[PDB]
Amino acid sequence: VTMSPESVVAAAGGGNNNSGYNEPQRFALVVIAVNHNVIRIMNGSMGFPIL
Amino acid sequence: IVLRGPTLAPTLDRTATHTVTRPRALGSFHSTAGPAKHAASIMAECKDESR
Numbered sequence: 001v002t003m004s005p006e007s008v009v010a011a012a013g014g015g016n017n018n019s020g021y022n023e024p025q026r027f028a029l030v031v032i033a034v035n036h037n038v039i040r041i042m043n044g045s046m047g048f049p050i051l
Numbered sequence: 052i053v054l055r056g057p058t059l060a061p062t063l064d065r066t067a068t069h070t071v072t073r074p075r076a077l078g079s080f081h082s083t084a085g086p087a088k089h090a091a092s093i094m095a096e097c098k099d100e101s102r
Binding site for chain 2: 045047049
């Protein structure tokens with residue numbers, strides 16, 4: 001991932017009043033994935049047949 | 052006198068009886084093995100300059 005000049009200039013402080021970037025800003029990256037699974041029901045029990 | 056469909060409550064069955072909890076299936080995927088071996092170094096028994 002490539003950042004932006006706006007991000008690199010807002011990372012430092014120097015912003016005026018009611019600017020949001022008056023204080024130094026810190027950022028984090030989050031990644032989510034949605035996957036498939038199979039559940040087997042037998043003998044009154046629930047468990048993954050493939051783990 | 053009032054007539055209506057009689058209310059019948061199903062019965063029997065069994066709930067929360069003799070918990071077992073054995074659904075796990077062993078097995079996983081990872082590396083196979085490693086092809087590494089070594090010899091018994093090198094011996095040296097020679098002197099006297101026998102040509």
